[PDB]
Every structure is written in structure tokens, then in C-alpha cells.
Amino acid sequence: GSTRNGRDSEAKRLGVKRFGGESVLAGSIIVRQRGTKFHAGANVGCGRDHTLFAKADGKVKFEVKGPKNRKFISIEA
Amino acid sequence: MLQPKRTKFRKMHKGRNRGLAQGTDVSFGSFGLKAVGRGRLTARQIEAARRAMTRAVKRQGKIWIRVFPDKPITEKPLAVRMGKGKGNVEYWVALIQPGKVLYEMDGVPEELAREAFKLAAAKLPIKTTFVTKTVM
Amino acid sequence: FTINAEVRKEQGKGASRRLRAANKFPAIIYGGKEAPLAIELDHDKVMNMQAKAEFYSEVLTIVVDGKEIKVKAQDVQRHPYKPKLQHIDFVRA
Amino acid sequence: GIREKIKLVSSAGTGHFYTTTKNKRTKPEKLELKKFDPVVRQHVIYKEAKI
Amino acid sequence: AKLHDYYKDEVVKKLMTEFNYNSVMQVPRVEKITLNMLAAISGQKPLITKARKSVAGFKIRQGYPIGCKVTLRGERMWEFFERFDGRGNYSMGVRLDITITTTAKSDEEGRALLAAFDFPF
Amino acid sequence: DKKSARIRRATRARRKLQELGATRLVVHRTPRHIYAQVIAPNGSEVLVAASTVEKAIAEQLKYTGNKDAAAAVGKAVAERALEKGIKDVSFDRSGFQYHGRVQALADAAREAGLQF
RNA sequence: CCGACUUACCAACCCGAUGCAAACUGCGAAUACCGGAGAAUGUUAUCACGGGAGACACACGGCGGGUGCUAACGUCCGUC
RNA sequence: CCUCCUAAAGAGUAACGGAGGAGCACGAAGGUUGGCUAAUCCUGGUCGGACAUCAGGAGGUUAGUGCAAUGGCAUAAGCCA
RNA sequence: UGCCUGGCGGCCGUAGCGCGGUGGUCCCACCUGACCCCAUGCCGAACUCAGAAGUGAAACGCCGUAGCGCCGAUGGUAGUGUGGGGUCUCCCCAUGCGAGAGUAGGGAACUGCCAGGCA
Ligand SMILES: [K+]
Ligand SMILES: [K+]
Ligand SMILES: [K+]
Ligand SMILES: [Mg+2]
Ligand SMILES: [Mg+2]
Ligand SMILES: [Mg+2]
Ligand SMILES: [Mg+2]
Ligand SMILES: [Mg+2]
Ligand SMILES: [Mg+2]
Ligand SMILES: [Mg+2]
Ligand SMILES: [Mg+2]
Ligand SMILES: [Mg+2]
Ligand SMILES: [Mg+2]
Ligand SMILES: [Mg+2]
Ligand SMILES: [Mg+2]
Ligand SMILES: [Mg+2]
Ligand SMILES: [Mg+2]
Ligand SMILES: [Mg+2]
Ligand SMILES: [Mg+2]
Ligand SMILES: [Mg+2]
Incomplete structure (x- = not known):
């Protein structure tokens, strides 16, 4: 007859906006994410929704770093 | 007949049944009944085949069932249209790939294992073959 | 047991399936400090002798390139349902 | 919901107000906070009033 | 002060013969004594312990004051000592409860220390 | 487990x-000594240093693990940083x-002319 | 007040073996996608702005799937 | 409106597909400084039991997160002032 | 220049555990006391201060040792882009890419700056 499902939320367009080696202007969003899947490295800020954004003009650099092998995003300015 | 005691979810996507089996060796007993074909074994079929081979051995030796029917199969009732939600779970199946050892047996002669498994095989929808434990 | 073998020219899936479609099968000899030797074996010959439980326990000689390599059977990949051998690992004794 | 809107009115007499919500039942005491009044351009005491 | 002064004079001395420790630092010390249930018994004001969780059984909830305790150490523990769980530490039931924690790394070593102070056994 | 903490x-x-x-x-502090290293932004290079294991500071002291010694190291490390022209620092209390010896060191370091 | 033998026995944890998962992952491709560089080739094939639209019932076939009975010349997506 | 899956390892992606949530809460549950670290079990211990609190150990986040799910979280985003 | 110790990094398990040693001159640790500075929702346990009689017991560092964790080929297998084929619910062929698991084996980290002890 009827079903109790049939709901879903709008897709949030998360994920990587600027990949490795891409030249960005300061302020450019590099990744939108839920929590810190990626962490802010050098010249990268972490917004209130865990958005990583460039704090300097330069090139995006993904790196695995530290004792937990966490993924950091940096900007090579 | 076999069925998961619990599941996280009631209903499962149809899926596909590609690939060759994992669990291709006689790992427990001396003798095994192996799938050559691909398909679904229902819990009723698994039970029918189990009762056949068990009766053949006259409750002697030991029987393992290597497959478990953990996939719920839904059906729509008669005279209902398409849509209006997924059908109700009616039975459980194990997906079989070629090479899957279905049953194993120990503590009988090979002759009697071969007969017991022949009687079991006649209950199953898939082509089977008798196999023996290998040293490697 | 004495197995005759040739050095495999070609490796990979295509080469290996062509071997088996001509009643041969690939094998590997490794171990010690020499480089692994990738060999091809006649299927029916080896399948016949590996029926015996002694094949897997005792040292075997692979006559490859006319040279005697003493080996133990380390691993066998069997065909999933047919009574055939896909591959054997041999370790240099 | 339960929470009712209130205005926080500047003590400087500028007329400037902030607005916020308040659970009136659990907290009946008047909300008082030092907030920036942009008319006098100083932090001053703001006090709760009705919206 | 009575028993601190006697711990090192006699009790250190005797335990150093018994087990034949290589150092005085091996010897069991009374590290602390904790009196779970109090301030006339102890002198130290008790700490009201609270529920780690709710329990369907006792009609308790998490952060409910369901206990009270004091941790006597040093001079004040020695002065109350006068007034085995399997690594040196003892517990007495008083018809409150009491615990004596030790740096003794064995079960025979805790009963060596308490009973050297002529603790009733 | 005091170090890890x-x-x-x-x-x-x-x-x-x-x-x-x-x-x-x-700063590093122990119950007997106190130490001070000015480290470059990289974290991998000590620019200047001063301690109460350094015989020059220690031979002029009463006890090496007191607030008096802490102030002596503070003055020393600051003076040596000012020689190299290291004026701007951030204090890592580690x-x-x-408080106490750490503060006494920081106070003497500022009093000499480190800018934190 | 206790205890002690005792089971057609039913048995958690842990240990060793065996499988299974769209809503499992201590692994992890091919492809695809984003960016950079360099040739050749291509009627600028690109982007912007402006004039004029039409169209917003799609169909089958291949591949990946949901649904249905891995029923439908069925149904609903993705992609060619 | 939110979360997951379907969704084919960028984004997006349908069905009267499969599962759940929201229509708030909070002047602290916000800011900051300083500090702290979980579940669960074993051994011992007044009442006290399977489970209260105490002590030690094992364990190592299997906890926690104002409320779903997912992704996070120890430098904690968890806990206290 | 070697050996030891401390601090700060690189690196993030070939680097972590366990288990057997081993070190106190120096350093480190525990330690010794607390009217003090500061501290405990109780407690100098911690934090903090004033110290140096004692011990390396614990911890810590170092060394040894595969019982683990960890790393890990080669070959084969699985999958798969493109083209083609079949008996087309699934496969196969040509070509390109090629895991995961497991196997042999590796494996008891290595390294920069500064300071101090000793030789
Ligand atoms: K961007
Ligand atoms: K299509
Ligand atoms: K706060
Ligand atoms: Mg979503
Ligand atoms: Mg990290
Ligand atoms: Mg191919
Ligand atoms: Mg329309
Ligand atoms: Mg339309
Ligand atoms: Mg369409
Ligand atoms: Mg289709
Ligand atoms: Mg149609
Ligand atoms: Mg169709
Ligand atoms: Mg996607
Ligand atoms: Mg995709
Ligand atoms: Mg579309
Ligand atoms: Mg907070
Ligand atoms: Mg102390
Ligand atoms: Mg020791
Ligand atoms: Mg591999
Ligand atoms: Mg070790």
C-alpha cells in the first residue's frame, strides 16, 4: 500500500574543490567536509564547518604527516 | 531451516552473483560437495539436501554445512501492482559461485560419502561435484 | 619426482591463460638468495604426480634449462572447481 | 518553541537594542550583558526588555 | 610520627632480611589509606563521591552524591594507622570501609608490612 | 607518568x-636544574641556550633548582639572544x-629585553 | 546454615579454523574527474555578451544498478 | 528540511526504492585560560545484591558528543574549574 | 673524534609491544621536607615551592632476544579501460592497467640542532 521511507536531504556538494598542484588565490576553498577528514597545514585555515581554505596565494599540497598519518592540506606560497 | 537470528536490515538489494567462490577446499571433513554452477541456494534446498545426505549415512560420521542463507529474498503478493514499496521477505538464500564447497563430511567411507552427496545433489538447483581433502 | 620445465618468456594474465589453454601452467621457483625463476610446466604430468602425498612433502627436482633445481612444493593454486592446477610455488631447498 | 524573543536594550539611552531568545521559565531573572552600542561606540550594559 | 619513625627503624629493617631486597626502595611503603563511606574519624574533610552512571536497580542517576571518601597520606595516615587485592593493597570492612595502598609488588609483601606494624590477623 | 602528561x-x-x-x-625544568633554549621556527635548530648545567651560570649560584637560578638562566638566555639580535620570541612553558621558577625565568628574560 | 557428586544437557568470553554484507573496512584497482606542461592536429572546435528560437511525452540497444520474478517490447536512475 | 545507502572511488543523479531524524535546545551547553581523560572487566572491600561508592590492576576509547545518521574529535571537538 | 645523558625537531610501527639483561660521576628519576609561593570539589597524589641524606626499586635510557605487532617481494589469481566474441542471469579472446589476501623474506628503527658528563 504505502511505505514509511521516501525521504532524503539535499546533496551538500562536499569534497575537494582544488586538487594537488592547483594555483589558488587566498580565501579559495580547497575542501568542504564534515569534520577534519583533511587537516589544515601551512597557509590553510579551517572554517567553522571544517572547510579548509587558502590563507595565501600558492599551490595546493596534500601531505600525510605526524604520528596518526593524518592528511594535511597546505599552500606552497 | 537456516536463517540469520538477527540482521541489521530486513531487506537487501538484489545485487549480482559474479566471480568464483571463496571456500574452495575441504577445510573441515574428508569429503566435500562442491558447486560447479552459479546460483542461489534457498534454506529449504539446503535443508532438503542435508536431510538426504544425513539419512544416507544413518547418523554416522559428521556433516558440515559451509554455506549459510543470509540473503533475504522479497516477493510481491499476487494481484498487486508494481511499486508501492519493496515486497516482503519470503525466504533466505545463499549466493553460490563455482568452486564453493557446500557440504563436507568425515567419518564415513568415500563410497558412502559419494552416495550420500549424490542423494543430496539431486535436491539442489546447481551442478555439483564430489571433492576430497587435499594435502595442499 | 623429476619435473621438466622451461623458463617462461611471457608473464601476466594473457600469457598465463594461453599456457593453460595449451595444457601447461605457470609456476615460480623462489627462495635462497638467487632471483625467482618463472617456469612453465606440463599440466597432466604434474597433476598425475601431485595426486601422491609424497609430492608435497619430499624434495623434488625441476630440470629447467637442463639444470637440476632441488625444491619443495610451497603453495598450489588449484582451479576453483575443475581438477586442474593453476600455479605452483616452489622454494629452492 | 518554549524560548521567547526578548530585546536587550542599551543603558546608554541611544534606543539601540539587540534581540535574542530566552527560556522564561527556567530563567526568570533579567538577562544583562555588556554589549557594543554602535551609536555611542562603546561597550555598555544591555538589559532585557519585551520584544 | 609514631609509626613513620618505626617504619624505617624496624619494619624496613625486618623486610630487608625477609625477602632480601637489594634496596630500601624495594621495601613496601604505606603509600596512602583511603576511608570510603567521617571527619571525626579522619580529621580530613570527606569528598562526596558521585555516581559514575545511572543504575536501573538502586534508583540512582549519574552525578548523584551516593558516597563520601578521604585519602589519608603521609603524617596523617601514619597517625590514623595507629588510631589483599593481589598487589600489596589491603582493605578492612568496619561494621564504612577502609583501604591501605602499598608499593609492595606481591601478596606476601603486603601482609609482611601490615603485620610488621602488628596489624591484627 | 608525569613526562607524558x-x-x-x-x-x-x-x-x-x-x-x-x-x-x-x-623552558625545561627539573627538581635540580632549569634550562632555556631559543629555537628557530623550524623546531630543528637551537639558536642560543642557557642552563644551570652550564658551569658558568651554575658556579655563581647557591642552588641550581630554585627561583634565583631560574632568574639567572632567564637573564643569561635573554642576554645571549640579544647578542644574535633575537628580540622577538614566544614563550613555550613546555x-x-x-609560575614559580618558570615565571621567574620568564620575568628575568623580559627584564633583560626579550619581547614576549 | 550449608555443601558435594552430577548431567540427552543449554552455554558467554577467549583461542584456532570457514564463509557472508547496499546502509561493514586495520586494504584497494581499472576507469573517470581536477590541475600543470609539451607536440601534432582540428574551418575557434572555447568563453563572454547580444537578436531569434525550439524543447522540457522520449524509444531501443550496450554497460553499471534500484524496482519487479537478474519476468515483461515492464519500470526508475547513471553512462555511451 | 537533515543523515546514511542506492550513487557506477570528483560533483550531481530517479522510483509510491531501503533505513532513520528535524520544525529545537543552551547566558551556558557561548568566549577564553588552566587543568583532566573513557567503556568494560578481573582481584579485594560495612550494609551492598549482577549492577552504587572505595582501592589496585587489566584494558586503551570497544567511551563521550544536549537530540538522527554520517564524517570528525586526545593539541581533544569529550570531562572539570 | 668516540661513549653517556638531557632538551627540541625530522620521521610516524622495518620505528610499536613482550621478554632477558643493564646504568647512577654527570644527567634523569624517584627521593627529602613544606611557616613559605602556589595547590587538593578530601589528600603536598598531582600541581608548587625549599632542598640533596638515600636508591636505581619503580620509571626512564641503553643493550640483547622473533613470541607478537609491523613491513614485504616474485609469480599467480581477482577486478578493469578499449576493441572483439559466446552457450549472454554470466563469461571468453586481443591489448593496456593490475590488486587484496597469502608466500619467500625483512625486521629489535634511523636521523638533525643545541647543551652537559666522561674518555
Ligand atoms: K576554490
Ligand atoms: K541505458
Ligand atoms: K565556557
Ligand atoms: Mg546526503
Ligand atoms: Mg597526525
Ligand atoms: Mg584480458
Ligand atoms: Mg513538463
Ligand atoms: Mg518529462
Ligand atoms: Mg529517460
Ligand atoms: Mg540493465
Ligand atoms: Mg520501456
Ligand atoms: Mg528489460
Ligand atoms: Mg559521488
Ligand atoms: Mg563516479
Ligand atoms: Mg541527469
Ligand atoms: Mg568548549
Ligand atoms: Mg615531590
Ligand atoms: Mg630498575
Ligand atoms: Mg600485494
Ligand atoms: Mg624493545
């Missing part, structure tokens, strides 16, 4: 100073409370 206390501030790219006056 202190390294946990130290980490947040240290990582912040690394993020900022600060030259870092790192998990120790900004």
Missing part, C-alpha cells in the same frame, strides 16, 4: 607556535605552570 599539556601551545612560525623560548 606534561608533553600532552605542552602540545597545543607548541603546535600553535609552529603554525604561527614563532621563534620559541622553550607543560609546566607559568
Whole structure:
């Protein structure tokens, strides 16, 4: 007859906006994410929704770093 | 007949049944009944085949069932249209790939294992073959 | 047991399936400090002798390139349902 | 919901107000906070009033 | 002060013969004594312990004051000592409860220390 | 487990100073000595240093692990930093409370003319 | 007040073996996608702005799937 | 309106597909400084039991997160002032 | 220049555990006391201060040792882009890419700056 499902939320367009080696202007969003899947490295800020954004003009650099092998995003300015 | 005691979810996507089996060796007993074909074994079929081979051995030796029917199969009732939600779970199946050892047996002669498994095989929808434990 | 073998020219899936479609099968000899030797074996010959439980326990000689390599059977990949051998690992004794 | 809107009115007499919500039942005491009044351009005491 | 002064004079001395420790630092010390249930018994004001969780059984909830305790150490523990769980530490039931924690790394070593102070056994 | 607990206390501030790219006056304190290293932003290079194991400071002291000795190291490390022209530093208390000997060192370091 | 033998026995944890998962992952491709560089080739094939639209019932076939009975010349997506 | 899956490892992606949530809460449950670290079990211990609190150990986040799910979280985003 | 110790990094398990040693001159640790500075929702346990009689017991560092964790080929297998084929619910062929698991084996980290002890 009827079903109790049939709901879903709008897709949030998360994920990587600027990949490795891409030249960005300061302020450019590099990744939108839920929590810190990626962490802010050098010249990268972490917004209130865990958005990583460039704090300097330069090139995006993904790196695995530290004792937990966490993924950091940096900007090579 | 076999069925998961619990599941996280009631209903499962149809899926596909590609690939060759994992669990291709006689790992427990001396003798095994192996799938050559691909398909679904229902819990009723698994039970029918189990009762056949068990009766053949006259409750002697030991029987393992290597497959478990953990996939719920839904059906729509008669005279209902398409849509209006997924059908109700009616039975459980194990997906079989070629090479899957279905049953194993120990503590009988090979002759009697071969007969017991022949009687079991006649209950199953898939082509089977008798196999023996290998040293490697 | 004495197995005759040739050095495999070609490796990979295509080469290996062509071997088996001509009643041969690939094998590997490794171990010690020499480089692994990738060999091809006649299927029916080896399948016949590996029926015996002694094949897997005792040292075997692979006559490859006319040279005697003493080996133990380390691993066998069997065909999933047919009574055939896909591959054997041999370790240099 | 339960929470009712209130205005926080500047003590400087500028007329400037902030607005916020308040659970009136659990907290009946008047909300008082030092907030920036942009008319006098100083932090001053703001006090709760009705919206 | 009575028993601190006697711990090192006699009790250190005797335990150093018994087990034949290589150092005085091996010897069991009374590290602390904790009196779970109090301030006339102890002198130290008790700490009201609270529920780690709710329990369907006792009609308790998490952060409910369901206990009270004091941790006597040093001079004040020695002065109350006068007034085995399997690594040196003892517990007495008083018809409150009491615990004596030790740096003794064995079960025979805790009963060596308490009973050297002529603790009733 | 006092070192590991202190390294946990130290980490947040240290990582912040690394993020900022600060030259870092790192203190270490023990029950007997106190130490001070000015470390470059990289974290891998000590620019200047002063301690109460350094015989010159220690031979002029009463006890090496007191607030008087801490102030003596503070003055020393600061004076030597000012020789190289290291004026701007950030103080890494290294998990120790900004209090007593650590504070006494920081106070003397500022009093000499480090800018933190 | 206790205890002690005792089971057609039913048995958690842990240990060793065996499988299974769209809503499992201590692993992890091919492809695809984003960016950079360099040739050749291509009627600028690109982007912007402006004039004029039409169209917003799609169909089958291949591949990946949901649904249905891995029923439908069925149904609903993706992609060619 | 939110979360997951379907969704084919960028984004997006349908069905009267499969599962759940929201229509708030909070002047602290916000800011900052300083500090702290979980579940669960074993051994011992007044009442006290399977489970209260105490002590030690094992364990190592299997906890926690104002409320779903997912992704996070120890430098904690968890806990206290 | 070697050996030891401390601090701060690189690196993030070939680097971590366990288990057997081993070190106190120096350093480190525990330690010794607390009217003090400061501290305990009780407690100098911790934090903090004033110290140096004692011990390396614990911890810590170092060394040894595969019982683990960890790393890990080669070959084969699985999958798969493109083209083609079949008996087309699934496969196969040509070509390109090629895991995961497991196997042999590796494996008891390595390294920069500064300071101090010793030789
Ligand atoms: K961007
Ligand atoms: K299509
Ligand atoms: K706050
Ligand atoms: Mg979503
Ligand atoms: Mg990390
Ligand atoms: Mg191919
Ligand atoms: Mg329309
Ligand atoms: Mg339409
Ligand atoms: Mg369409
Ligand atoms: Mg289709
Ligand atoms: Mg149609
Ligand atoms: Mg169709
Ligand atoms: Mg996607
Ligand atoms: Mg995709
Ligand atoms: Mg579309
Ligand atoms: Mg907070
Ligand atoms: Mg002390
Ligand atoms: Mg020791
Ligand atoms: Mg591999
Ligand atoms: Mg070791």
C-alpha cells in the first residue's frame, strides 16, 4: 500500500574543490567536509564547518604527516 | 531451516552473483560437495539436501554445512501492482559461485560419502561435484 | 619426482591463460638468495604426480634449462572447481 | 518553541537594542550583558526588555 | 610520627632480611589509606563521591552524591594507622570501609608490612 | 607518568607556535636544574641556550633548582639572544605552570629585553 | 546454615579454523574527474555578451544498478 | 528540511526504492585560560545484591558528543574549574 | 673524534609491544621536607615551592632476544579501460592497467640542532 521511507536531504556538494598542484588565490576553498577528514597545514585555515581554505596565494599540497598519518592540506606560497 | 537470528536490515538489494567462490577446499571433513554452477541456494534446498545426505549415512560420521542463507529474498503478493514499496521477505538464500564447497563430511567411507552427496545433489538447483581433502 | 620445465618468456594474465589453454601452467621457483625463476610446466604430468602425498612433502627436482633445481612444493593454486592446477610455488631447498 | 524573543536594550539611552531568545521559565531573572552600542561606540550594559 | 619513625627503624629493617631486597626502595611503603563511606574519624574533610552512571536497580542517576571518601597520606595516615587485592593493597570492612595502598609488588609483601606494624590477623 | 602528561599539556601551545612560525623560548625544568633554549621556527635548530648545567651560570649560584637560578638562566638566555639580535620570541612553558621558577625565568628574560 | 557428586544437557568470553554484507573496512584497482606542461592536429572546435528560437511525452540497444520474478517490447536512475 | 545507502572511488543523479531524524535546545551547553581523560572487566572491600561508592590492576576509547545518521574529535571537538 | 645523558625537531610501527639483561660521576628519576609561593570539589597524589641524606626499586635510557605487532617481494589469481566474441542471469579472446589476501623474506628503527658528563 504505502511505505514509511521516501525521504532524503539535499546533496551538500562536499569534497575537494582544488586538487594537488592547483594555483589558488587566498580565501579559495580547497575542501568542504564534515569534520577534519583533511587537516589544515601551512597557509590553510579551517572554517567553522571544517572547510579548509587558502590563507595565501600558492599551490595546493596534500601531505600525510605526524604520528596518526593524518592528511594535511597546505599552500606552497 | 537456516536463517540469520538477527540482521541489521530486513531487506537487501538484489545485487549480482559474479566471480568464483571463496571456500574452495575441504577445510573441515574428508569429503566435500562442491558447486560447479552459479546460483542461489534457498534454506529449504539446503535443508532438503542435508536431510538426504544425513539419512544416507544413518547418523554416522559428521556433516558440515559451509554455506549459510543470509540473503533475504522479497516477493510481491499476487494481484498487486508494481511499486508501492519493496515486497516482503519470503525466504533466505545463499549466493553460490563455482568452486564453493557446500557440504563436507568425515567419518564415513568415500563410497558412502559419494552416495550420500549424490542423494543430496539431486535436491539442489546447481551442478555439483564430489571433492576430497587435499594435502595442499 | 623429476619435473621438466622451461623458463617462461611471457608473464601476466594473457600469457598465463594461453599456457593453460595449451595444457601447461605457470609456476615460480623462489627462495635462497638467487632471483625467482618463472617456469612453465606440463599440466597432466604434474597433476598425475601431485595426486601422491609424497609430492608435497619430499624434495623434488625441476630440470629447467637442463639444470637440476632441488625444491619443495610451497603453495598450489588449484582451479576453483575443475581438477586442474593453476600455479605452483616452489622454494629452492 | 518554549524560548521567547526578548530585546536587550542599551543603558546608554541611544534606543539601540539587540534581540535574542530566552527560556522564561527556567530563567526568570533579567538577562544583562555588556554589549557594543554602535551609536555611542562603546561597550555598555544591555538589559532585557519585551520584544 | 609514631609509626613513620618505626617504619624505617624496624619494619624496613625486618623486610630487608625477609625477602632480601637489594634496596630500601624495594621495601613496601604505606603509600596512602583511603576511608570510603567521617571527619571525626579522619580529621580530613570527606569528598562526596558521585555516581559514575545511572543504575536501573538502586534508583540512582549519574552525578548523584551516593558516597563520601578521604585519602589519608603521609603524617596523617601514619597517625590514623595507629588510631589483599593481589598487589600489596589491603582493605578492612568496619561494621564504612577502609583501604591501605602499598608499593609492595606481591601478596606476601603486603601482609609482611601490615603485620610488621602488628596489624591484627 | 608525569613526562607524558606534561608533553600532552605542552602540545597545543607548541603546535600553535609552529603554525604561527614563532621563534620559541622553550623552558625545561627539573627538581635540580632549569634550562632555556631559543629555537628557530623550524623546531630543528637551537639558536642560543642557557642552563644551570652550564658551569658558568651554575658556579655563581647557591642552588641550581630554585627561583634565583631560574632568574639567572632567564637573564643569561635573554642576554645571549640579544647578542644574535633575537628580540622577538614566544614563550613555550613546555607543560609546566607559568609560575614559580618558570615565571621567574620568564620575568628575568623580559627584564633583560626579550619581547614576549 | 550449608555443601558435594552430577548431567540427552543449554552455554558467554577467549583461542584456532570457514564463509557472508547496499546502509561493514586495520586494504584497494581499472576507469573517470581536477590541475600543470609539451607536440601534432582540428574551418575557434572555447568563453563572454547580444537578436531569434525550439524543447522540457522520449524509444531501443550496450554497460553499471534500484524496482519487479537478474519476468515483461515492464519500470526508475547513471553512462555511451 | 537533515543523515546514511542506492550513487557506477570528483560533483550531481530517479522510483509510491531501503533505513532513520528535524520544525529545537543552551547566558551556558557561548568566549577564553588552566587543568583532566573513557567503556568494560578481573582481584579485594560495612550494609551492598549482577549492577552504587572505595582501592589496585587489566584494558586503551570497544567511551563521550544536549537530540538522527554520517564524517570528525586526545593539541581533544569529550570531562572539570 | 668516540661513549653517556638531557632538551627540541625530522620521521610516524622495518620505528610499536613482550621478554632477558643493564646504568647512577654527570644527567634523569624517584627521593627529602613544606611557616613559605602556589595547590587538593578530601589528600603536598598531582600541581608548587625549599632542598640533596638515600636508591636505581619503580620509571626512564641503553643493550640483547622473533613470541607478537609491523613491513614485504616474485609469480599467480581477482577486478578493469578499449576493441572483439559466446552457450549472454554470466563469461571468453586481443591489448593496456593490475590488486587484496597469502608466500619467500625483512625486521629489535634511523636521523638533525643545541647543551652537559666522561674518555
Ligand atoms: K576554490
Ligand atoms: K541505458
Ligand atoms: K565556557
Ligand atoms: Mg546526503
Ligand atoms: Mg597526525
Ligand atoms: Mg584480458
Ligand atoms: Mg513538463
Ligand atoms: Mg518529462
Ligand atoms: Mg529517460
Ligand atoms: Mg540493465
Ligand atoms: Mg520501456
Ligand atoms: Mg528489460
Ligand atoms: Mg559521488
Ligand atoms: Mg563516479
Ligand atoms: Mg541527469
Ligand atoms: Mg568548549
Ligand atoms: Mg615531590
Ligand atoms: Mg630498575
Ligand atoms: Mg600485494
Ligand atoms: Mg624493545
